[PDB]
Amino acid sequence: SLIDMYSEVLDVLSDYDASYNTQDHLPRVVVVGDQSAGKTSVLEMIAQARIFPRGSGEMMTRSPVKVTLSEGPHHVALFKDSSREFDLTKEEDLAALRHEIELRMRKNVKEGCTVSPETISLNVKGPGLQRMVLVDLPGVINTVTSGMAPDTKETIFSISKAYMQNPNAIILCIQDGSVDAERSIVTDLVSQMDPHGRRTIFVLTKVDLAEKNVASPSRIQQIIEGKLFPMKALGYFAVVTGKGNSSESIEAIREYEEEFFQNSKLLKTSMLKAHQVTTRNLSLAVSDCFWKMVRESVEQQADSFKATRFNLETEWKNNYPRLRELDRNELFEKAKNEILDEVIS
Amino acid sequence: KEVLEDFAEDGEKKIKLLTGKRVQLAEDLKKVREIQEKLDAFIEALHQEK
Amino acid sequence: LSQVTPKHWEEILQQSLWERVSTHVIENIYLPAAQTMNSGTFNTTVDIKLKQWTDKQLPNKAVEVAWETLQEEFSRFMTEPKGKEHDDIFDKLKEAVKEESIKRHKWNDFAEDSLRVIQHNALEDRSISDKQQWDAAIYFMEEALQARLKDTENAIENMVGPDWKKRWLYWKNRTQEQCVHNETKNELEKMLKCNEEHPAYLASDEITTVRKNLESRGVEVDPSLIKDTWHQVYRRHFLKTALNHCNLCRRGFYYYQRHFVDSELECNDVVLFWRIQRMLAITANTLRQQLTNTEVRRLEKNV
Amino acid sequence: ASDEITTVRKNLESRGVEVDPSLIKDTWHQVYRRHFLKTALNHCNLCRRG
Numbered sequence A: 001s002l003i004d005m006y007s008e009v010l011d012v013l014s015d016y017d018a019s020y021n022t023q024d025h026l027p028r029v030v031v032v033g034d035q036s037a038g039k040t041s042v043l044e045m046i047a048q049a050r051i052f053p054r055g056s057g058e059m060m061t062r063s064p065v066k067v068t069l070s071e072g073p074h075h076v077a078l079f080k081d082s083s084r085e086f087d088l089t090k091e092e093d094l095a096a097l098r099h100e101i102e103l104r105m106r107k108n109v110k111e112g113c114t115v116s117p118e119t120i121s122l123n124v125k126g127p128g129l130q131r132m133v134l135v136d137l138p139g140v141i142n143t144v145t146s147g148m149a150p151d152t153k154e155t156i157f158s159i160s161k162a163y164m165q166n167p168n169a170i171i172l173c174i175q176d177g178s179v180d181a182e183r184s185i186v187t188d189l190v191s192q193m194d195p196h197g198r199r200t201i202f203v204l205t206k207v208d209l210a211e212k213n214v215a216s217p218s219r220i221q222q223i224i225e226g227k228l229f230p231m232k233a234l235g236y237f238a239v240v241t242g243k244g245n246s247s248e249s250i251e252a253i254r255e256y257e258e259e260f261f262q263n264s265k266l267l268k269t270s271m272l273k274a275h276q277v278t279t280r281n282l283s284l285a286v287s288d289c290f291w292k293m294v295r296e297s298v299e300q301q302a303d304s305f306k307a308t309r310f311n312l313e314t315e316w317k318n319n320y321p322r323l324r325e326l327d328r329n330e331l332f333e334k335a336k337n338e339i340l341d342e343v344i345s
Numbered sequence B: 001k002e003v004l005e006d007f008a009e010d011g012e013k014k015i016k017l018l019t020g021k022r023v024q025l026a027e028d029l030k031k032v033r034e035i036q037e038k039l040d041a042f043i044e045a046l047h048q049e050k
Numbered sequence C: 001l002s003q004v005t006p007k008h009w010e011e012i013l014q015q016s017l018w019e020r021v022s023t024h025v026i027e028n029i030y031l032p033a034a035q036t037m038n039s040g041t042f043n044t045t046v047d048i049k050l051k052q053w054t055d056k057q058l059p060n061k062a063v064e065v066a067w068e069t070l071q072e073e074f075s076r077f078m079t080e081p082k083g084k085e086h087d088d089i090f091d092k093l094k095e096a097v098k099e100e101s102i103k104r105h106k107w108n109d110f111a112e113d114s115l116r117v118i119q120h121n122a123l124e125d126r127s128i129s130d131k132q133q134w135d136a137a138i139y140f141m142e143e144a145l146q147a148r149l150k151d152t153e154n155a156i157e158n159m160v161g162p163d164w165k166k167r168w169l170y171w172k173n174r175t176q177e178q179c180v181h182n183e184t185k186n187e188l189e190k191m192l193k194c195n196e197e198h199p200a201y202l203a204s205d206e207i208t209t210v211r212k213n214l215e216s217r218g219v220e221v222d223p224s225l226i227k228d229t230w231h232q233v234y235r236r237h238f239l240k241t242a243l244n245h246c247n248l249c250r251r252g253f254y255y256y257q258r259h260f261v262d263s264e265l266e267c268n269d270v271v272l273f274w275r276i277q278r279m280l281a282i283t284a285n286t287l288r289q290q291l292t293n294t295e296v297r298r299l300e301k302n303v
Numbered sequence D: 001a002s003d004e005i006t007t008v009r010k011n012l013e014s015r016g017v018e019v020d021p022s023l024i025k026d027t028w029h030q031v032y033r034r035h036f037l038k039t040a041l042n043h044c045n046l047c048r049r050g
Helices: A002-016 A039-047 A091-107 A152-164 A185-193 A207-212 A217-225 A250-262 A279-319 A328-344 B002-009 B011-017 B021-049 C006-034 C039-056 C058-078 C089-104 C110-123 C131-159 C164-170 C176-194 C204-216 C223-249 C253-257 C268-302 D002-014 D021-047
Strands: A028-033 A065-069 A076-079 A120-124 A169-176 A200-205 A235-238
Touching (some): A002 A065, A002 A120, A039 A200, A039 A250, A039 A279, A091 A120, A152 A169, A200 A207, A279 C039, A328 B021, C006 C039, C039 C058, C058 C110, C089 C268, C131 C176, C131 C223, C131 C253, C131 C268, C176 C204, C176 C223
16 A cells, blocks of 8 residues: 555665665665574564575575565565566465565576675565565575675675665564574674664564573563663564474464463563564554654655756756657657658758 | 667667757656655555545 | 835835845855856756745845844834933833833744745746836846955955055055965966956866966965965956946847847846845835734734 | 976967977977087086186
């Protein structure tokens, strides 16, 4: 609905302005994750459909995907360059869509590289879906894979930094709950790049696995309440991505996560706030904050665009008052007609 | 007529041949106006929901 | 106070408002746009600058100017000495009430928004149908240019001094720095004479060429001083060039009457100044009517 | 020196003449040689009674 137009506006802005002079004035959602950190599961959980390719420890996400969640009569996903609709309600179409996405990732790869910086805009429709735009990025690997290009890690870092360059962009960090914050570089980079924390949001995965590992409650509470981390963010949320299997259904994972947290002793002991868990609470808070920032930003952009267009029109009148503006195609038609006239003359 | 049809099917040649202040002004105005129209529709639809 | 002829109010308001904004208009708008030789780009820059300034700053300045003029007449009438018959006991009470009334004064908030559109449409016209209006704009431009030229001459005279003929008559001797500035002036004179359409900005290699000629005269001058002298010289030269343009444009109304766009006598400046003069006349009349009607009741209420 | 060439070239442009730096260098070499020889001749006259 509304977010469909917002996504279209962003796409046209990127095409019109190759640089980020104007693209850095609108809010955005940036997602950065490590290897096997459940970044794909979290994005799939929000989209309520497993549309990304799955691999046994291999980084299937070889190209960034701009996944857009909108309001639609049916839960379907549509490519920007292709009109072939894919029904996410059927598992057979989901598998075909995953293969198509992987094929698009390989096609966009240039010569001499493994991961291409090009982003593919995907519109995932569905009734009741949150109206927001998500960005999928390749996982950050501590050790460079032998089968990948030597600059793949640098390309991933550059893409994440370019996305984070927008002062209104919302940071969505994804890591693993079984790995300490000192063993991951992504959390350090996020804290360094956002000293204020006015837009940083941290997402922790495999919370059930961490609890089954007998994690210290103090560390979990400090992470959620922002004590261990020097940065002071708006808030912290924890979600469960299941048991880690690549074939588990989304509905079973969500139901299991809700039951696990309902019967969890930590929540009933009031160690962690009840509204700081579950994906529904996080999605609602992110959507409301993102939409409010979009409303203010779009008003400023609309006034600026109107003024800019007025200046262009004024220049046209001053230079060419007795002429009409035509595009490249129309000028070609006018030119050929003049040629035919000269032939007759 | 044959030459024009071949030229019409190749937009790259048109871009190289059509370089001028008038051409750029028209193209930029079209793009800016198109973006502005989308922004107006987005703003109006957003504000009419409530 | 309301028994004064409207002409007196309009003359005071027009002169005060014009002098209040003349410096900002000429320096911040006219000068940057006049650098370009393209009339279309020149006009486009002027229109963009006008819209930006008018939509936010013009109503505030007009309100302050109108209120200040009302304050001058009102405060004076409170303290006008009526010869030897003037009483002094009431003067203390008059001043106390005057200060309190001024603090409680509050101009209409909707006047600023209404006037913004009013002068916007007034300035949007680009046709001069009256021959006398064209002549009036020329005279108005000449007076404004002469005032700016006199200030430029004063700064140049301070940096250099009187002419050798004049300094001999007055028995004044130039200082060493003054003579240095005079030599720099001669160098800039030759540079401007050769290239009559030199850009306002300077270049490093130009400074080196000027400095070497100064060394040929046994004078060492820092690049900063040369840049400052060049700025003043260019301003004076541009003002003189505009004056010559005014003389050429004096008989250009007939050419403009036939829309001789192809003719090189494109008196864009005269049209722009005429728009400003017309806008000032409308603004003065509108403020006079508002002062005579809108704010009299508020003044009475506060009293 | 290069800046000397620029100063000479600008004076030539003031006369409406465009000259390449190579030509200026060649002319300067011949002029300096002639000037130096004349200077030596003046030195000979002074050194006559030396």
